[PDB]
């Protein structure tokens, strides 16, 4: 079998840049979030298969908030990316993972959070949002993995056909 760094248990850290945090959660619902604490709320929800447009629940930097969710296929997961922009402010959507694994990904790297989007197993690290903030915490739900830069074919790979 493939041979990561993991899995670690949920927890809140400093991911050190240049890293996948590759997250790997066993329940839909909230997945990890993370912030540079001025104008950066960063998180991540899982969304199960065959779910029409609703309004969800989901705590998210501590406060209950309602947002708009749907999964049209009838077979993939779909990660959702949400962004908060200052710390009162609402939570708006900026990308989606739409997989057969229920993996995602993120690393800080270039003052920015790379995210893996797309649809597996095409899916790639092609957005990202820009934190300008290298001791960023992230808080995570779920166990994770850690994939240096090195292997981020690896990486990409895992998101793409598991493990
Ligand atoms: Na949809």
Redesign the pocket.
């Known amino acids: 079998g493939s041979t990561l760094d993991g899995p670690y248990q949920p927890t809140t850290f400093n991911l050190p840049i240049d890293y996948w945090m590759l997250i790997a959660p066993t329940q839909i619902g909230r997945v990890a979030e993370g912030t540079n604490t001025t104008d950066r709320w960063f998180a991540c929800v899982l969304v199960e298969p065959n779910v029409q447009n609703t309004q969800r629940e989901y705590v998210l930097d501590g406060q209950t908030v309602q947002l708009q969710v ?4 009838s077979t993939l997961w ?1 990660f959702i990316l949400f962004i908060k922009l200052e710390k009162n402010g609402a939570y708006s959507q900026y990308s989606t993972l739409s997989t057969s694994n229920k993996l995602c990904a993120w690393m800080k790297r270039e003052g920015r959070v790379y995210w893996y989007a797309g649809t597996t197993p095409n899916a790639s690290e092609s957005y990202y949002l820009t934190i300008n903030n290298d001791n960023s915490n992230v808080s995570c739900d779920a166990e994770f993995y850690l994939i240096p830069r090195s292997q981020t074919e690896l990486c990409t790979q895992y998101i793409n056909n598991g493990l």
């Open positions: 749907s999964n049209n296929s779909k």
